Structures are given as C-alpha cells and as structure tokens.
Amino acid sequence: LWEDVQRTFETPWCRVDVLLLQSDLANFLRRADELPRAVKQFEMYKSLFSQVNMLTSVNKILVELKDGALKPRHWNMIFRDIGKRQIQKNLLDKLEFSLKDVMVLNLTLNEILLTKIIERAQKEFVIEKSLNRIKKFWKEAQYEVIEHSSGLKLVREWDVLEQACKEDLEELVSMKASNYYKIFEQDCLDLESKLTKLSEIQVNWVEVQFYWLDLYGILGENLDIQNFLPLETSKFKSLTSEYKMITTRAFQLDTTIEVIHIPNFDTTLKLTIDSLKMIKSSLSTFLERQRRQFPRFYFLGNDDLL
C-alpha cells in the first residue's frame, strides 16, 4: 500500500498520466479504510494518508502540466525559478524525472508561476499542434498519378493536394504571430523554406503539365508536324525524357516534402518550363506563318489547322 504510493512517486513524469494517477489515488483512498487499527496507529497510515491527500490537492495542477504544451525548456525554467534546482539535462530532455521532484516545488503555494508558465506553454502549443499537422500531413501525401498513351505519369485530381499545400502555407505564415513560439523558430523557418520551395515546385508543375499535355496533343503522334519542326520536336522529346526521369525519381521517392531534397530539381523545373514556353511561342509563330501562307486558314482555328 505504502509501497504502491512510493512506486507512484518514483514513476517518471512521462510515465505518469492523470487518468492512471486518479485511478491509483482512488485505490489508495478506498484501501485506506480497510487497514486494521494496528496499521493506522502506526506511522505508515499517517504518512500514506498525508501523501494521498496532498496528491489529491495538486491533481488539477498536474492535469494542467500534463498537456503536450510543455517542452523540456519549460520544465527547466520551472525547476530553476521555483525549486532553485536542476535535473540532469539528459533526463530532462526525455521528460523522465520523479514526481517527488515535481512536488518538492510546493505546487499549491507557487501555483501562479506554474499557471503563467502553462499559459505560455499553451500559447506555444497552439503553434505546435498546427506544426504537427503539416509535419505528418505532407510527410507522405504523395501525388496520385496514372498512365496516358504509355507516356508520362500525369497526376490525378492534383488540384486538391495543390490547394492543401496552399492553405498549409497560409496557416504556417499566420501562426508566425504568437506570444510563446520562439522555441521552434529555426524549425518554423525550416518548415517555411520547405513549403515555399514546394509551393514554387507546384506552381511550376501545374504550368509544365498543362503545356506538356498541350504540345503532346500536337507533337509525338503525328509525324507530319514532327517533321515540320524537327528541332522543336527533338527539343520536346529531350524535355519529355528528362521530365520523365524527374517524375520517376519524385514518384518512387514516395515523400512529397523530401522532393525539395533532390538536387537540381527546381533548376530542372525552371529550365523545363522556360523551354516549353519557348517551344509554344515558336509553335505559335509557325501557326501564324502558315496562316499568312494561306489566308482562308483564319476561319479554321488553331485546333483544326493543327
């Protein structure tokens, strides 16, 4: 009984939970009355009853402290300011310190300092939870791709994941305003960089897919125009090959966020989109030249003339 109480104190901070602590305290209170008179006359009952009533008094503060808001820095400053003591940093980082060290801080009398510390921790936790979301969300969230005429892997329903990343940027740039968030500032900036690189990657993927499928209905199947634009057709085929390699690399990567970690990726996207734009401009020039070669073509339109 007293051994159970000592075990509860010696159980680490991360290993104790408020629900299990409440159940254990209920068991202690229930079994306190079952003790014979001889045990109660002994000091064991006095010590156990005092300790369990003390733990009952500090139940709510433990509930407040047990949220995911608190980081090891918060507990470090709690121990420094209140208990005027320190716990080994390796044990503090993994949140394994005895509940006795928590209690010797006299949580009841010093409840205001712990309350303001918990308020700051919750202010940082409002940021932390939104961080966790993107963290695991974009961790995978890959682009579902299919097959077109045995060619590239075009992404299906890509606009929804596009919009997801866009709103993730909006929320990451709006959470930058907080009272207690300066802990993950380097992490926050790292996440910002990752998602901004991804945003540019996505706004160029939409454009490159659009133009590649535009010219793919123009080149690659009808040899007449392919022979009519041999240099442009060769450039388009080379771009198709390199972008196919890029898509295979990114799709067997299986990690949307890690796509930025592939070197010469954004540069490849930029050169690809610039070359595609130039190819489309040259194609439009050829269209206009052919229309000048034959005035009646202006009625047929681009698709019909192609």
């Binding site: 077109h148 075009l154 992404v155 329903e157 606009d159 897919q209 499928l213």
Partner: protein, 818 residues
C-alpha cells in the same frame, strides 16, 4: 405500330442536371472531357451499331422547363447544320432518327429565336373530360392490382365500383368543390388521381371480408369508402369546418340510398363480427409521467390527431407522395414524427431543406438507409435496406429559393423521384429505379412572407393536406393533460389542473387577437408558446421547493411574462398585457392573495439560492453589483451602471440559459450593454464564451471550423459553451443557412462524413467508455450526440434595429422565430 419502327425514349429533367453533368465537361487537370448524359446516349446511338438504330426511332424529351443556357449548347443542334458542338473533341453528327422534345409551361426565359427554330405545340385547354380521366384512372388501378390479387374478387369489386358512383352527381360534386377556398389549391382535375388511387387502395385493403357479406351492405360500405376518399383527397386542404360543409354537400348530391358519410366516420374491422358500420367518439385516455413534458416524440391523442394519423397512414399505404400545409404553429413536424416512428412498416428520415440543398445531400441521406443492387429490369437500383418501408421527411419545401430563371432544382428532383420512380446517376450516366421510397413534406402557406409559390406540377403529383390550430377546446384538454402531468410533482393542487389550462388557453387566444403583424411582423403566437411556458413551469417546480397556491400562481404568471410579453414592444402594449393577465387570473382563479403581478413586482431567480423562488430586490441588486465588481477586477473593464431594467434582463437571460435549449434571440438597439450583459450572465453560471472573428473576405469555411471546434469542445470535453453572434457577423447567406440548420436541427448535416464521421464515431466511443457508458449503437450514438450538443450549447443573437433589411430577414426567418 404504324411504321413498325422501334421506339427509343430518354427522359431528362433539365434543372436537375447541370451542364457539366448533362453534356459532360473537360477535367481541369488533363482536359479529359467527361461524357455527360446527353452526349453519352448520343454516342451510344450513333457510334455503336450493335443496337438497332437504322430501323428504330430515337426520342429525347426534356420534361423540366428549359433555359437558354442549356440549349445554348443545343442551338447549334437546334440549327439546320444538324451537328453537336462539343467544347472539346470531335463534333458529333446527329441523324434524323434522333428527335428532341421539350416540355414546359412558362415562356418568360425563352428567346424568340428558339421559338422560330422549334415547332411549337400549345394546349389551351384540358385534353380530356373529368369522367374520362376518372375511368382511365380506374382502369390503371385495376391493371395495377390484377397481377397481384385474385381475379374473381377483383371482378366483383370493380363491377361494384363502376356501379357505385355515377359521373352525373360527380360533376355537381366537383363543381361545388371548385366553389370553395383552397390553400395552395389546384384544379380538381389534378386531385382526381389522388382521390381514385386512395379509394381503390383502401377498398383493396378490406379484401378478406368481401366474400361473406350481403352485396347490399358491400355497396353501402363501398359508397362510404368512396365518399371518405373523395372528401379527404379533394378537400384535404380545406379549413375543416368547410370540410364539414363539403361533407353535407356530398351527402346531399351523392346517392343517399347507401350508408351515409359522417364527419368522424370509421370502421373498426375485426374478425369477430361483420363490423362495418359507422363508429365515432372513441378517444382513449393516456396516462403519462412527469418527466415527459419535453420529449419531442410526445403527442396527445385527440379526434383530429387520430383522424390525421389514420388519413396519413392510409395515403402512405396508398403509395403516393404527400405534402403538408399548415400555419407555423400547426404542429406538423412532431405530429408527423409521432405518426411515423411508432409505425411498424415505415422508417423515419427527417431531413430539413435549406435555402439551397444540393441533390447529392439527399442522395447521401438515402445512402444511409439504402444500397445499390443490380438486376435486369432496372440494372442499377437504389431500393430499401431493411424490410420496413423507407420514407424521407423533407421539411419546408418552399424554403429553397429558385434559380436565376425560376424553378427550384431539387424540387424538380423530388418530382423526378416521385413521378418516374428514379433518376439518373450523374457519374454512371445510367438510369436508376427506386423501390417504393415515399416522399413526405410539410410547408407553410406561401402567403407567409419568404415562401415561394410552388409549381403546379409538384403539387399536382402529390396530395395536399391542411391542418390548422385545433380550436380552443382541444388545446384546453391537451394542456389539461399537460397540467395534470405537471401536478404529479405537487399532489396538493391536483384538482386545480383545469383552471390553469383554461387560463392559459384564454390568454393565448387573447394574445393572438390583440397582437398581430399589423403592429410588426413577429407577433405570432402558437401552441408552441404554451408548451414552452408549461415546460418553464415544470422546470421551476422541479427545481423549486414546495409552493403554496399563491406561489404557484405567481410563478405561472412569471413564466407567462417570460414567454409572451418579452417579445412585446412599447409600454402601452406591455400594460395592456398586464391588465389582460389581471382579468385572465380573476376569471380563471378563485384565489385572491397575490400582490402586484407586474414585471418589477415579480423577481424569480435561482442565482441567489439552490431553489428557484421569488427573491428580494435589494439582495439581488447587491449580488449583481458584487459580481460586476468581480468583473471589473478580472474581466473587461468598462464604465458600467446597474439599473432595474438591466437586472430584469439579467434574470431573463439566466432563465433562458438554464433552459435545455439556450437558443436565444436578443433584439433591441446598440450601445445598450447587450453584447456584454450576455457575457456577464454567462460568467455568472461559469460558461464558455466564443465570439466569431470575421473579415471582409471571410468565407463559409471560417465559421465552419469555428462552429465545428465549438461543437467538439461542447462534446469532447463538455465545455458548456455560449455563443454570441451579432448582426455584424451575419453578412452572407451561406453561413446564414448554416446557422438556420444548426438551430432547426441539432447537428451538422453536411460535414459529418468520411474522416469527420469516423473521428466523431471514435470520439463517441472514447467519451462513452471514459464515462462508463455502454452506448455503442451507431444511430443511438448520433442521437446521443444530438442530446449532448442540445444539453451543452447556448447561442444568443445580438441584433440592431429590426427595420434593417438584414435584421428583418433575421426576425422573419422561420427557424429563428420558432
């Protein structure tokens, strides 16, 4: 038959299917052009030759009214070039065998060029006589029932039906019927089908007892049944005393040689005797319990109640869509629920229509109780899931607003369901036939502002029933039952149940008479108000200690003030109500021991003690002052002053918040302290306050996640929150309809799917297990979530002057007033 050419028909309702579903559309990710219904069927007819199309004739009809935009893609098809012009891909040629039809009644939104390009056929009059229509309807019913029932009994009954009613007196009946006031009425030529179908079904219901009685008595009972059916179908929209007048009329004109139709006429058939005569005055008594004051599944039997129960059950068994009409306080929804849930053959699907409810919402609602099966007759099907019939209760069908060219699209969708018994699956692009999923709905008269007049097609295809306020006496008995139940708590004054009910009914009648929309457009009084005040009395008594007669009268008057007069303006109206309460009490109460009964002279609150009771003015003032001092200590520091009016408002707000439904409408002017007095009262009970944060581009999604997180906090951790919503917060109509739904309903009907549905389910699991509750029934989990949100959520509305158009819409909304 004339040419021996096969016929191909495809019926499409225009407004139901959008352009990207009808003609298809390209995908804005790879420009893959989706087929769409019309283009798909055209492709099947033209490109595919396995089907017979050279020898056959192919016919496409657009039953719904057409708008130029839909034919803006068909005008080329309508043009002499005879080619389909797709936005993407090749242009589909169309053969002469591919004919196109259009059907409508309104030409306001049709270009004259289309009129020139099409062939116009007009119907300036009816196509058939009344008698011929009736005869065809009987033939239809006979052929519908022959393939199921015995042929000889069918022969006997159909001969007796043909020889039962003669068209000559029927003409007089219908002509006199036209000479009668209807609500959303249509010409008798439309109600003929409802009358005949109801009659034939109900006479077929008594098949087993048609072989052992004399044919004279069989003729008598068949005349009784046909008279009853004609009454109910033809005059179901009548006032009810005009129903009695029509009863007398048809009694006179129709043959008197048979057993005569009476007002409260019914046959209690039992296999003990040839029980077929007229039965009346059979109302049974019901004993209830004290806690059953507010369970929205409670109804009290009356003659009108049982009559409407039986008529509704008969016409559902008649397999016909039904639409209900009545004043906003007529009680349609809950009497319908009590009529339908107890049924052992029908399943309740209560769905509230919005300003705009998309069709796939109804499709999902069907999915929750149906499944897709594939047969040969109808290929894909959407029939029932269990064995009991599935009937969906659409609510306020007139609430949805028409499109930019008129006509409500999902109203036509319901027309498609209940006319052609199916619809078209938009992605599958194949017709699906339903299996007897009936349609029931209730709508206030369009004379009520904010209600669009309904298209005659929809009203014609269904049947109309109007039920009004059940007189004054019927209210007296029902609230006498309520008051005996409420006096089960206090047996001291059991015999005083009648005076309270009589006083309440008389006060309600006088409130209706004195105050009307002539002053302003919210002086509407309904039996719902009486039910709310009896609940208030029940809560006061249950929470309060033993009360003397004077105490009971005082609390009754206080609840009368809080239910009736708190919506009143001016002081002339207020003192008029005051003196009205004086004469009401004096007439309906012998005890003369009350003092002044005015608002200032009544001070009932539970904030100063555990027991709700009359309390001293000064003590309440001191308590409020101390709490306000605490507010200045910790809450927002604003120069504030305490007076009697704001103290009275604090009492009102506390009483409203302690109610089970803390849905409050606070109407006044600005700078009066309302938006902060509500915070004060909320903190008095220690609630949680959330105020929405809006912007100049705040879409629906902002209020969506704010409302969802508030709901979760009220549910996941039982925060017991209070919501303050201001006239500034309401600017768009989307979250307007969201709030209207969350008020009229109790949950979110459009976001509880997929991952949201699963997290709701697992959160219910976690909360029930943590609380030690064994509740694991999914439907009962949904109902318990409804109960939790109802028990823990309180929303209050702070509004500017009602003269504002937005404020006028706020006060005039049905759910918000209700």
């Amino acid at each position: 038959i004339f040419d021996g050419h096969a016929n191909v028909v495809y019926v499409i309702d225009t407004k139901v299917l959008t352009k990207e579903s009808l003609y298809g559309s390209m995908l804005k990710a790879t420009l893959e052009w989706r087929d769409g219904l019309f283009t798909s069927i055209l492709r099947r007819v033209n490109d595919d030759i396995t089907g017979t199309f050279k020898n056959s004739r192919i016919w496409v009809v657009f039953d719904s009214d057409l708008d130029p935009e839909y034919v803006e893609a068909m005008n080329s098809v309508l043009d002499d070039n005879k080619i389909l012009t797709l936005p993407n891909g090749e242009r589909l040629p169309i053969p002469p065998n591919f004919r196109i039809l259009f059907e409508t009644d309104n030409l306001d939104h049709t270009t004259p060029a289309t009129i020139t390009r099409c062939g116009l056929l007009w119907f300036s009059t009816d196509v058939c006589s009344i008698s011929s229509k009736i005869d065809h309807l009987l033939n239809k019913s006979y052929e519908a029932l022959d393939n199921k029932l015995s042929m000889f009994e069918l022969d006997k009954l159909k001969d007796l039906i043909s020889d039962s009613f003669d068209m000559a007196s029927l003409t007089n009946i219908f002509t006199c019927s036209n000479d009668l006031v209807h609500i959303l009425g249509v010409r008798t030529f439309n109600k003929l089908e409802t009358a005949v179908q109801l009659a034939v079904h109900l006479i077929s219901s008594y098949r087993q007892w048609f072989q052992n009685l004399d044919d004279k008595s069989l003729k008598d009972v068949i005349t009784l049944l046909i008279k009853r059916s004609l009454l109910y179908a033809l005059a179901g929209d009548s006032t009810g005393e005009s129903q009695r007048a029509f009863i007398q009329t048809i009694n006179t004109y129709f043959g008197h040689d048979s057993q005569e139709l009476s007002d409260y006429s019914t046959i209690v058939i039992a296999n003990d005797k040839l029980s077929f005569s007229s039965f009346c005055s059979e109302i049974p008594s019901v004993s209830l319990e004290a806690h059953e004051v507010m369970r929205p599944d409670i109804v009290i039997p009356t003659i009108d109640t049982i009559k409407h129960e039986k008529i509704f059950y008969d016409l559902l068994n008649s397999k016909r869509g039904i639409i209900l009409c009545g004043p906003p306080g007529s009680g349609k929804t809950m009497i319908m629920n009590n009529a339908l849930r107890n049924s052992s053959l029908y399943d309740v699907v209560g769905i509230n229509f919005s300003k705009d409810t998309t069709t796939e919402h109804i499709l999902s609602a069907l999915h929750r109780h149906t499944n897709y099966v594939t047969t040969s007759k109808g290929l894909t099907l959407l029939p029932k899931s269990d064995i009991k019939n599935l009937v969906l209760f659409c609510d306020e069908i007139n609430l949805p607003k028409l499109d930019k060219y008129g006509s409500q699209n999902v109203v036509l969708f319901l027309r498609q369901l209940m006319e052609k018994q199916g619809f078209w699956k938009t992605p599958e692009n194949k017709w699906v036939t339903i299996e007897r999923i009936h349609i029931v709905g209730a709508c206030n008269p369009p004379t009520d502002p904010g209600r669009i007049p309904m298209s005659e097609r929809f009203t014609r295809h269904a049947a109309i029933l109007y039920l009004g306020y059940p007189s004054g006496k019927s209210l007296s008995q029902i609230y006498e039952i309520y008051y005996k139940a409420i006096f089960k708590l206090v047996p001291e004054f059991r015999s005083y149940t009648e005076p309270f009910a009589r006083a309440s009914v008389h006060l309600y009648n006088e409130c209706k008479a004195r105050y009307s929309t002539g002053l302003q457009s919210h002086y509407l009084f309904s039996p719902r108000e009486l039910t709310r005040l009896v609940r208030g009395v029940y809560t006061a008594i249950n929470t309060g200690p033993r009360q003397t007669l004077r105490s009971l009268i005082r609390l009754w008057a206080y609840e009368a003030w809080r239910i009736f007069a708190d919506r009143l303006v001016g002081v002339k109206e207020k003192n008029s109500f005051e003196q009205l309460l004086y004469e009401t009490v004096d007439k309906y109460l012998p005890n003369q021991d009350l003092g002044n009964i005015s608002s200032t002279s009544l001070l009932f609150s539970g904030l100063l003690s555990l027991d709700f009771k009359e309390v001293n003015k000064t003590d309440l003032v001191n308590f409020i002052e101390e709490r306000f001092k605490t507010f200045c200590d910790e809450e927002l520091e604003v120069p504030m002053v305490i007076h009697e009016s704001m103290v009275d408002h604090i009492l009102r707000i506390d009483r409203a918040l302690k109610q089970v439904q803390g849905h409050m409408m606070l109407i006044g002017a600005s700078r009066t302290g309302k938006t902060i007095l509500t915070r004060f009262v909320a903190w008095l009970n220690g609630l949680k306050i959330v105020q929405p944060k809006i912007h100049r581009h705040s879409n629906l999604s902002d209020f969506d996640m704010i409302l969802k997180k508030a709901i979760s906090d009220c549910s996941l951790k039982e925060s017991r929150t209070c919501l303050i919503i201001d006239e500034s917060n309401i600017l768009e109509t989307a979250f307007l309809e969201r709030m209207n739904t969350l008020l009229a309903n109790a949950d979110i009907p459009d976001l509880f799917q997929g991952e949201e549905y699963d997290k709701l389910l697992n959160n219910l699991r976690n909360k029930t297990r943590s609380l030690g509750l064994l509740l694991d029934t999914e439907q009962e989990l949904y109902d318990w979530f409804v109960g939790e949100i109802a028990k823990n959520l309180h929303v209050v509305f702070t509004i500017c002057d009602p003269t504002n158009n937005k404020s006028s819409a706020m006060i005039s909304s049905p759910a918000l007033f209700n």
